[PDB]
């Protein structure tokens, strides 16, 4: 359960954003991708898996998951296979959007804001994920 | 102090540009292929890093992609103050290279191997332990 992520897609300005959420902490990694294809989804999960100890990823099971490429990357990496969260992220992107020319930049500012915001001695998602994983390591 | 310190270096393979960010205290790395070694692409890479980890200081090589405005603007916004590892990553990339059509894929397989290999703990374990401790 320290190892469980949910992967969802979300759409803005005609562009495709994948969002991975660490379920236990609410920490997110998100990026604009050129298209919602098995290959691009597989690349996104390989990146995630090198960064965090990802054991299970829950997906929407649509078209980009029926092929071989995501399955091949998850097998290699050892990975087994909140619409509120897309709404919260889009809210933050709208608040920084005019600060960046490119949507991709705005997305990353939004990930930064989401992961570092302190809602109170009451931690950020970034603090919550490191605390959850470090506790489990020992 | 050294929980928040990263070093950023560039490295080159197959005519393509790879940025590597190393968390100095743990040896954990984030790396990716970028289109070109420009201020803009460098700034994007640092903005991504800074949303993922609590980055306070990043040591760079201070060359051409750092003289302009964008990297400075991303670091200001994110609150960031301004080659054995390239050789090791390249070693790992060559061992997995034939398994991927694209260099970018091989790079990420290499980051995965580097960060997860057992050395007691892996780099991935080391970084989370260092940062969790620092949180009090």
């Amino acid at each position: 359960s320290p190892g469980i992520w949910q992967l969802d897609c979300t759409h803005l300005e005609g562009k495709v954003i994948l969002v991975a959420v660490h379920v236990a902490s609410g920490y997110i990694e998100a990026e604009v991708i050129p298209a919602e294809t098995g290959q691009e989804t597989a690349y996104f999960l390989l990146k995630l898996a090198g960064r965090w100890p990802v054991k299970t990823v829950h997906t929407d099971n649509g078209s980009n998951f029926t092929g071989a490429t995501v399955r091949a990357a998850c097998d290699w990496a050892g990975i087994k296979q909140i619409e509120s969260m897309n709404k919260e992220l889009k809210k933050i992107i709208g608040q920084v959007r005019d600060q960046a020319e490119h949507l991709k930049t705005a997305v990353q500012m939004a990930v930064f804001i989401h992961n570092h915001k302190r809602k109170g001695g009451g931690y950020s998602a970034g603090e919550r994920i490191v605390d959850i994983i470090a506790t489990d390591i020992q | 102090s050294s929980p928040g310190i990263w070093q950023l270096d560039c490295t080159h393979l197959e005519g393509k540009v790879i940025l590597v960010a190393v968390h100095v205290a743990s040896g954990y790395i984030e790396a990716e292929v970028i289109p070109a070694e420009t201020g803009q692409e460098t700034a994007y890479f640092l903005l991504k890093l800074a949303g993922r980890w609590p980055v306070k200081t990043v040591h760079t090589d201070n060359g051409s992609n750092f003289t302009g405005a964008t990297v400075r603007a991303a670091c200001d916004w994110a609150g960031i103050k301004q080659e054995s590892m390239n050789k090791e990553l390249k070693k790992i990339i060559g061992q997995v290279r034939d398994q991927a059509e694209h260099l970018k894929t091989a790079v990420q397989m290499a980051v995965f191997i580097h960060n997860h290999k057992r050395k007691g703990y892996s780099a991935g374990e080391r970084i989370v332990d260092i940062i969790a401790t620092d949180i009090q």
Partner: peptide, 6 residues
């Protein structure tokens, strides 16, 4: 003028 360009 924006963060990433101009």
């Amino acid at each position: 003028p924006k963060i990433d360009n101009x």
